[PDB]
Amino acid sequence: ESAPITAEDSWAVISAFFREKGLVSQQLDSFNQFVDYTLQDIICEDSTLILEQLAQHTTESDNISRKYEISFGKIYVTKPMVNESDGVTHALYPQEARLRNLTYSSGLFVDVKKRTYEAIDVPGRELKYELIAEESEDDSESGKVFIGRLPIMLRSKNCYLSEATESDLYKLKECPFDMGGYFIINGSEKVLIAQERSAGNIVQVFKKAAPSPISHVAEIRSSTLQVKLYGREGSSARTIKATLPYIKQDIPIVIIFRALGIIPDGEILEHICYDVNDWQMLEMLKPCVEDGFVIQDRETALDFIGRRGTALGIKKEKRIQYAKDILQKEFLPHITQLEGFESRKAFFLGYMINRLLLCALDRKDQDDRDHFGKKRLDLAGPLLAQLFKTLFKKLTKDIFRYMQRTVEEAHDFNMKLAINAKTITSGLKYALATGNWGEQKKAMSSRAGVSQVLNRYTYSSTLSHLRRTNTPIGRDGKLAKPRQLHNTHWGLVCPAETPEGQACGLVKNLSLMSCISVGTDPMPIITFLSEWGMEPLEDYVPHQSPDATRVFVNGVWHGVHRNPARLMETLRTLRRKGDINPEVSMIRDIREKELKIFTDAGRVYRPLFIVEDDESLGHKELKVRKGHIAKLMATEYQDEYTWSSLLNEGLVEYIDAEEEESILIAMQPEDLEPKRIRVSHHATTFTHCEIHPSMILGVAASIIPFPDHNQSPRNTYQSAMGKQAMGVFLTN
């Protein structure tokens, strides 16, 4: 029962995987995340609306200043239903929406509370408002203000189809072979194809050809910061300059450090360079010190900043305050926004310029822009959140404008009249139907093709359509590198199946087991990380400990550490034992002494096995055994013991395209022990195994027989032509 594993067990585990997740799980999970959590936060961002009407001083009775406060509360979502022209209300089902050209959607209810404050406007004195009237109907059903209608994706949590059995689907006349994952808009089925994006909060070092004085560039997007190094290699003149937002001329780096709060010159180099012995680092930083030593004053730099604003002739002190506020408000917002976090910003700027200068000293290379680990996929959820935020902002602006208008006439406003509930509904319906992802007024410049009409020609065509990703680069753009297949696509993208013509390589189809992460909070991770022996970045001195690992969380440096091996072992223990959900990625780079933790959304991951060293057998072996496979067979035939049972026991692990840079995988299980030509790989420190190589293929190419005896373009051609065969697209 302690025996090794054979490929039959691999197919057993895959059978369990598809019996648990499904082929369209990504859309459903993104929609559930959006509806349950993000929708509440989008309104809670802008709950309070304030009107401050000062006294017109026309008469004594007009000397009272007024304040109006509007606040929002919970969100309630009903099951989809329709009200006919007669005013009768009945629950709407997909058949009626399809036949009658309706729109599958539901209604949204939000709590609203109002407050009125009145103060006596005494000139020369601060206004002291007092609570007088507060309208809050939380104790009655009239408090739920109807705000709009939201489309519903099939088979999601709200839809009636979620809990339907086979006889339920037949009496309602469903195809049991239908999976959901699409909207019904205007009586036609629509689907949202995943949209590819380049990640943010990651410093990237580039390079330039030299007809121009530019030599290197360091980029970060949080708001953008460019710290450029000018001066050719080997010359005496070295310049390092940063380009801040709303500052045009630009100013050097030592001036930035002086303005930021680090006055002494010796501390600058402790911020930049983390190795005392290296002399080339300081040699390249010498001209910066020489030029920045002339001015020991923040205020000259702040005067530099003040002149370049649109307003001209401002007094010096106001310019000082403005330039002071620019740093904490718009300079690297992804670290912090509130006041007093200057040490973190100074160290992060030092780290960025350190990495730029390291690349400038040929110790490393340019960042690869094609690496699939630096790309995120936007599903229905994020796109809906974007559009909902925009429309809600416009709607609340309109409410404020109308309420001001009715205050001008001294008329009480009806909250059920100030709201134009048609704005949200019309905007969402127009965006989903036309596909132009933007406002109706500015739809010309918005993204297109985001929403497409589902293809039902054959069943495999529906399957292939619900699993498609688009790379929003100009399809006539002559950039060859995004088109070509890249080393990081192993197991996450189908190599065979791609369109032909102008969309070659730009349209991608996932493999059978490449899921996507939903999103999770980073705060508990940071709290635990500081709990288990992490020194904060405030109390970090380079010279006391020059061999300290740096610690990152989603691209913001929080400090250092001294013994990282046990931290990684404990972190992976907790990730494997369910204390943290396995969608979080945790990489360690030994060569540069770095730790990176990612908890964001949009990362493609695939399952893999786990290799551990068994001393009783004297060598390594998988954690999985014949007992687990027997339990899987028992549960499958009984259709308990499921895929999550394997996951929580530390038998499988989800690996993205970034952690893969620091692992070793044995492809066949028998390759882990000490026709065709199969070579015995020299490795002996294996960490994971491939569940099965066949899964590196999509859904289209999983029907060719013996695909490896074929030239690859032939596999591509059949993956194309498999969507034009005639057959039973649905059993109903």
Binding site: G234, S235, S236, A237
Partner: protein, 167 residues
């Protein structure tokens, strides 16, 4: 090449050297900007041997101009291989054209037989320089040293980066 020189490699390499663009920055393994406060004597033993060579080999005008030599030095440790590749004699090419161009930089230079080819490039300026000017030694000399490395052409024709032999 010419009909006579076509079959022999040596005239071909002479022509190849005579065509390629050669500049000072390419021929210095260490064109190091050093402090040269008193060029009369140094601490490094290697340049000390070269010192007495020219100090017994300088004319009366050079003896008068001893004070014109900059308080900083272009100390040229020159690579033997690069110098011999372009058939570049140390003295004639190092000094004739360089002093002829603007009478800007004088040199104490050794014969090629020394194990370390060390040149001392000391710029020449009138003593009539202003007090504020004379105080800012480094300010003039770093700039003129950069303009010296970049803008002096020992031999060759412009814009031709490489020349290569083929059969």
């Amino acid at each position: 090449l010419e009909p006579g020189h076509a079959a022999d490699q040596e005239q071909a390499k002479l022509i190849r050297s005579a065509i390629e663009h050669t500049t000072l920055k390419s021929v210095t393994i260490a064109s190091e900007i050093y402090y040269d406060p008193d060029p009369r004597s140094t601490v490094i033993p290697e340049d000390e041997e070269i010192i007495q060579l020219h100090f017994s080999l300088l004319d009366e005008e050079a003896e008068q101009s001893f004070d014109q030599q900059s308080p900083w030095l272009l100390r040229l440790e020159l690579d033997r291989a690069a110098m011999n590749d372009k058939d570049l004699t140390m003295g004639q090419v190092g000094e004739r054209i360089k002093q002829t161009f603007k009478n800007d930089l004088f040199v104490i230079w050794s014969e090629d037989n020394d194990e370390k080819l060390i040149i001392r490039c000391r710029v020449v300026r009138p003593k009539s320089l202003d007090a504020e000017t004379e105080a800012e030694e480094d300010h003039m000399l770093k700039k003129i040293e950069n303009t010296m490395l970049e803008n002096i052409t020992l031999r060759g024709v412009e814009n031709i980066e490489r020349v290569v032999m083929m059969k």
